[PDB]
Amino acid sequence: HHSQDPMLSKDIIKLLNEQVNKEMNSSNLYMSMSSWCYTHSLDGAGLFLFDHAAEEYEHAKKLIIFLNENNVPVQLTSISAPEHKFEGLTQIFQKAYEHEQHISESINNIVDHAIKSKDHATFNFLQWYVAEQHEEEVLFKDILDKIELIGNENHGLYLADQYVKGIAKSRK
Amino acid sequence: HHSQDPMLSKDIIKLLNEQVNKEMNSSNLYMSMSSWCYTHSLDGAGLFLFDHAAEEYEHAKKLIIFLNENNVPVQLTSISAPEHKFEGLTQIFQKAYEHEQHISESINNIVDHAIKSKDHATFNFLQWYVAEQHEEEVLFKDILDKIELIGNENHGLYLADQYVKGIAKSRK
Amino acid sequence: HHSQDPMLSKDIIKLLNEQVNKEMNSSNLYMSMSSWCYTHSLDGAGLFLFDHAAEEYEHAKKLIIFLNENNVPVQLTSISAPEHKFEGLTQIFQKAYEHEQHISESINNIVDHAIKSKDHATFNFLQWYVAEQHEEEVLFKDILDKIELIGNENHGLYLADQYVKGIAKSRKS
Amino acid sequence: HHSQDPMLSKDIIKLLNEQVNKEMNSSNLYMSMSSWCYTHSLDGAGLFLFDHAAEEYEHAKKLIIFLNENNVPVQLTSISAPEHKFEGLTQIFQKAYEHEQHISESINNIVDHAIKSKDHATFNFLQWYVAEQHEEEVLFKDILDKIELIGNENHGLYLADQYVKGIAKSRK
Amino acid sequence: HHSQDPMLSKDIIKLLNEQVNKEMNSSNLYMSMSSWCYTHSLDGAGLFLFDHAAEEYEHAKKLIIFLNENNVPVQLTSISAPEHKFEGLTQIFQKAYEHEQHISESINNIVDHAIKSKDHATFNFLQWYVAEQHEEEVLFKDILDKIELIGNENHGLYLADQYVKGIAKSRK
Amino acid sequence: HHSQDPMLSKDIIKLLNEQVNKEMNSSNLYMSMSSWCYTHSLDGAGLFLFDHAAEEYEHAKKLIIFLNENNVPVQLTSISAPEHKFEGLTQIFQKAYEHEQHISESINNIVDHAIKSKDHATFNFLQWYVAEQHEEEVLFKDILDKIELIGNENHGLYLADQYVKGIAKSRKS
Ligand SMILES: [Fe+3]
Ligand SMILES: [Fe+3]
Ligand SMILES: [Fe+3]
Ligand SMILES: [Fe+3]
Ligand SMILES: [Fe+3]
Ligand SMILES: [Fe+3]
Ligand SMILES: [Fe+3]
Ligand SMILES: [Fe+3]
Ligand SMILES: [Fe+3]
Ligand SMILES: [Fe+3]
Ligand SMILES: [Fe+3]
Ligand SMILES: [Fe+3]
Ligand SMILES: [Fe+3]
Ligand SMILES: [Fe+3]
């Protein structure tokens, strides 16, 4: 039997499949960072990063759904194991904020390509994704700002972890 | 500051970490199988397999939670691209059922090791997982049974896909 | 058309089928005991044993369901005519308690075999059955204890039967 | 202590005790037929026949209750192992319909004996049983009629099983 | 009058009776640790440890119930006076965590003996106890981790006690 | 860091700590009595005595709470192994009633000491304990009266146990 051709262009297909794998890598990275926090008595950060990792997989699932609906084959690729060794809470959140900046950049790029190739179905679809990623990038900026304000001096790690714990709980 | 040592034995840690990675791999496989179905007009099987893939990630998360609570570092390994080429609906579910048999075996192995090393916290924890995996293995057996009963002659693929669609919706 | 092979091992299949037939045999034994009581003015014990017999059939059905879901053919055997002649209420409950002890042992044997064969699907499935059988064994122990505490002196049978009647009614609701 | 004699005649006692054993045998036959269906991918018929087997045991229990209330000793004899060899879905339902015909005949016989004996307590008691058996005989006639209407050609068994599955669920 | 013999084996009887006495001893230890905290201005830890002591007595009662139902005589031996000399909050929780580890080991031992003896009534019974003990061991690990993360420098004891006070109230 | 001194006098502290240990000892005695009953087919008395044992521990906890709030160190002593061999239901309740009489006396002694030392915080605190202990002493008197009225002639033990079972159940709800 005959099935209809993919409804998206080759360039958009490539960028979207790359994005699915980027989100899966993100989930892995954040699970690893979370585990580091959990094994170093920082369960506030552990919980926050675990929940964030899960949300990254949710992004991957939403991108996959869009690919499926357009008759576009999903291309799940090989991905390196995430980094597992970290220096401390500050370094983790510095690395995470940088990572979010990079993800934001990657989304901006696809949206720009949608405009260029007049793919406004894809432009329209990606708007939840632009909005949600901006929120996440702002969130990591805010957490990093707070960790740096508190500092590492006497009880500082505890104070920072409890602050992140509060955010983790409030974000359901 | 000092954090407490991992609360599980080296062998159990190894087996549980391997299992996390197995479930992550399973999620990728099922996403790939789902995509094949969606791009070959089998959206019933597409939906069922997508939802099943998501459930495998849920298993991985629950295993991670148990590792975290026991102060056991999560060791996420490199991701290898899942199989993406398939012959048809029957072959997909034959491969899936075989995969589920393998997963059941892997769980039986961990539970047996928990008994052998007198790790009854782990034994007790794994019981939801034994129960749920059994349900999944039976489900795949039943779907494969139905696909083979229906056949492949005129309208057969359609009837099978609609049957699987019904199951997918009922499990929501 | 091809159907999938049985999902359980040959040894586990045989034990579970044997257990189905054990529960069916138990149901008949208890119906016969129940009838003896009813025909000897012991309707409290009659009701208790009737309801217990019915619960044994429910156990058989639950085991059959598990076999069915695993693509395991159910093998129902001949059921021997149960004992029908009894000496009295005490003898019936002595026999019943001994029977319950045997059933408990038979379950322990299957669960042990599941562990040894690494069949944790079956191990996990049987836990409701282990728990419910333990409660049943304890119940028959308690009833036997009570019958023996009361005795058959002046109104003893009546008192014991009423005691059992109360239990029967409480287990309904 | 003296207990009152049985309240029913020797002939009625014999017939009712035989009926209890007939219903128990029926339950076993239906469990066996059910198992055949389940192990041959016909879970619609499997469920239907399982639920029917349980209903036949319910009939046995109700007959036992009536014997008990009349101070009539219940005489359970050996219950021979049921047939387990079956050719297919049509043959199972052909055998089942014929079996239900025999059961209907057995009930008619007891009711006639009650009339002849002027045992109107028993006549009146059996009315639920006459009505329920009639409904069951009609039901098996209808299912067999449908299995034969559908036939075994391309997807026929699947359609028949799904039809019977519908009936099974509606009688829950 | 004759009463039925104990329903459990001699080895299982010994182990369960020893466990009752262990739980009673644990209750006393925790009451003593609780009192130390209360009399040293650590009422958060005082409340937590008091409530924990009461929970250990609840475990003793549940084990006693199981012995009673099996016609097994309860053998209460002398319960030696608990340690009352403590150095500080960290030492108390270090000792507590080590104590919970020992309790976990004792339970694993009984469950293993039940398996070896084919006593699955006892195995099945103990599952609530395995699960609840695991949660308690994890909890003490977490509290100790937090006490050590905070430390004893300026306001450290106060912060740790308030943290434990929070946990105490949340478990009510 | 400095914590405030105990808020109660040395003599009151000692009496209250002794009372904590008395209640813990009582709990164990009653658990042992309860077990004897359960293992001799007297589950009514078994349940009653088990629930009573648990209530004694609750008394110990309430006393500990008072000590804690007054910055008084709790001093838990060794608990001797309770008596475990008994002659029968009557002897158990004779022993229990005598025990309750002793507990009542021990409370009277503390309350009297509180009055003499002008410790009315402690006097006031103990009033729930005086009241609850009186109700307990009366209850054991009543049960003993009933066991002795019934006796052990033909079905006597059964009747007495069922009577106690009814009390046990009524005190739950
Ligand atoms: Fe993000
Ligand atoms: Fe994102
Ligand atoms: Fe699975
Ligand atoms: Fe799984
Ligand atoms: Fe049984
Ligand atoms: Fe049973
Ligand atoms: Fe019928
Ligand atoms: Fe019928
Ligand atoms: Fe058709
Ligand atoms: Fe504990
Ligand atoms: Fe414990
Ligand atoms: Fe500070
Ligand atoms: Fe008292
Ligand atoms: Fe008292």
Swiss-Prot record, chains A, B, D, E:
PANTHER family: BACTERIAL NON-HEME FERRITIN, FERRITIN. The gene is ftnA. Fe cation 2 binds at E56, E100, Q133. GO terms for molecular function: ferric iron binding; ferrous iron binding; ferroxidase activity; identical protein binding. The keyword Cytoplasm applies. Its main location: cytoplasm. It is found in: Cytoplasm. This is Bacterial non-heme ferritin. InterPro entries: Ferritin, Ferritin-like, Ferritin-like_diiron, Ferritin-like_SF, Ferritin_DPS_dom, Ferritin_prok.
